[PDB]
Amino acid sequence: FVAGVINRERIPTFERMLWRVCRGNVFLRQAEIENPLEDPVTGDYVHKSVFIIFFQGDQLKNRVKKICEGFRASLYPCPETPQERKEMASGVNTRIDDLQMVLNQTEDHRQRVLQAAAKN
Amino acid sequence: KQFGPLVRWLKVNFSEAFIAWIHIKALRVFVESVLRYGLPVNFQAMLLQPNKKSVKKLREVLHELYKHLDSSAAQQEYYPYVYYKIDC
């Protein structure tokens, strides 16, 4: 399906469950990240991999959503082969940089205001 | 006089229900084989009346026979071979 996000802890058993669903109908998109970013919920730089299957059947996709719910598999993509997906990725990078720089400015402003608030 | 044909009623209706039951189970086996394999051929359904206490031996035999096929996925329903139970 996608080189999504998983903490790589139940990926083997995730493959086993998907092999108990279908007989491995489609090769699972495989990717791994070394020393990844902080997870939004866990709040730590946890290791991440991903092993997820693409499907053509509707019931199969429903089961994939079910097993993604049952497991710790974050999946919110727009998996489109053509170039518009990569243009979307570039725009996402631009927004990410904007978020980073505004967050830095806000943090510095907060620090200054807090120092003044202490001294008063 | 109700009991008279009541025997025929219940016996015939149980006959129909049982026939439907075994037919459904055969369809289930056909579907399971056709899914666990691709374009299928002579999957060889088989009937077993297991001897007493020899369930463990039969499970071992079938595991040795066909556990290479999956080796990771197929228990209560996940066997290395298509499996069903029948009461009688």
Place this chain on the structure above:
Amino acid sequence: QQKYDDEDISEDIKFLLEKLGESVQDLSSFDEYSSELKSGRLEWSPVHKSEKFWRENAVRLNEKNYELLKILTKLLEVSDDPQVLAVAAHDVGEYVRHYPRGKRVIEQLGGKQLVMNHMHHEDQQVRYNALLAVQKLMVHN
């Protein structure tokens, strides 16, 4: 909040407060704000801080072809008075917060880029107003 025995004091305070409330309610009008921006006479005022003007009249901020919001963009590029620019940034932030769908129009207009520029303004208040405006513009981004 304090209570006085002289009923006259309480009655006069009630009168003055009520009529001042009425006066500031009368001040609150999109026509006033639009005139301020059309002639460029920008300054902090109760209209610039009236919650009903930002919330109820958020549709009024959606001008014809968003020309008033384009005037905000023009002032983000043109106005050099720091207070006027802070006013523009705060008003843009209010408009985005009460109408997130206009933020895409702002990005098309390039006003968002102007607020990115105004983050590093030479006056701290303008920096703060631009910061809040962009922070509102970062919703769902």
Place this chain on the structure above:
Amino acid sequence: TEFWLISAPGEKTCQQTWEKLHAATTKNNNLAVSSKFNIPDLKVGTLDVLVGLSDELAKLDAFVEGVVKKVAQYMADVLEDSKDKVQENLLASGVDLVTYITRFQWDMAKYPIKQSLKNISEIIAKGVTQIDNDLKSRASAYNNLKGNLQNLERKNAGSLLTR
């Protein structure tokens, strides 16, 4: 009595004799009774349709298990040709369950070979539903008549005060 309905991949025709006659590695070295099966050759549609079909088949088989064992229990209550202890089973296809299981054949007459799988499942579901409902009505009527008979017996039971 317990029977098992298994199946192998079937890559080779030697699998026919490996599962039945191959006493070296077959079931308990050819001690458990081994018998071939009749299974129709039926068309399949698409994969998600097959997933839905398998789920529906499992659910319907569970319901039919309930139905068949329930009619067996009601016949046991009737106490004729089946009892909760003796005559543990009735006759399917007019023969005892062992003979029908051992010689199970496909009833294409009722479920034609050229009907899709879903249509056959639907036909079976309708047939068993109507059969079960009608038999429940008949058994309820018979049990109500029995209860009325026993109530009349109780009214004619006691001593010279209440009998």
Place this chain on the structure above:
Amino acid sequence: ALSDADVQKQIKHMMAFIEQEANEKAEEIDAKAEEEFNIEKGRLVQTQRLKIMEYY
């Protein structure tokens, strides 16, 4: 479980099913073509004949 070669074999199985679906859809469109032939042909013949007979 399955090797990568077996994954390509299962892709080929998906292809057999896809071609089966294609055949089904093409034959269904052919059946619908026959049905519309019958219905529209009868309709047009009826309308033209009725016009001619009213003229008559």
